[PDB]
Symmetry: C2
Subunit: 108 residues, 2 copies
């Protein structure tokens, strides 16, 4: 929701929107891919538990997939935050940073 917060508080201006469209789309795609992996792992968990409701090799491996996808989402979001920042007009970065920093410290 970091990117949602940022869009809510400091939306891109017209030129920034046009310039950053590809990178925003690419991130949306990357996020979708990670979430697809997380959902597939939920599916594996369901299948496994239906066959044996225990902490089996299949449950362990699917749980590892969930953990990795959970971590990847966080890194992808953060890298994108810096990517978007690089594409802002310099004058717009201080507000963007403020919102970002406050969002992180809210999570502190």
């Amino acid at each position: 929701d970091l990117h949602e917060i940022l869009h809510e508080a400091v939306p891109l201006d017209a030129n920034e929107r046009e310039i950053l469209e590809l990178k925003q789309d690419a991130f949306a795609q990357r996020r979708r891919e990670i979430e697809t992996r997380l959902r597939a792992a939920n599916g594996k968990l369901a299948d496994a538990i239906a066959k044996n409701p225990a902490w089996s090799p299949e449950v362990e491996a699917a749980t590892q997939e969930v953990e990795r996808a959970a971590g990847d989402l966080q890194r992808a979001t953060l890298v994108h935050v810096f990517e978007m920042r690089a594409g802002l007009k310099p004058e717009h970065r201080p507000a963007y940073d403020r919102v970002l920093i406050d969002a992180l410290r809210r999570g502190s």
Copy 2:
């Protein structure tokens, strides 16, 4: 939400409830531990960014802590679902299993 979904989704006799409450406490302490680490990590991110808005060694290190904490919370949740199941009498486990499989299946769509 997996825990919310399973939360009170099956009936519990008094002895099962007693045990589930103890396991709920254990999970709360585990969750607080992971969240404490997550909060500290985010604060380190915030400090680094306010000082230098770039991907520094500090941001890299704190990000890795966020990653681990995010993965830890997911594993802790799944582990806890199995711990709750173990608190049920054997005869009551199938009903729990059905809600669990159903939730995970909906979770894959």
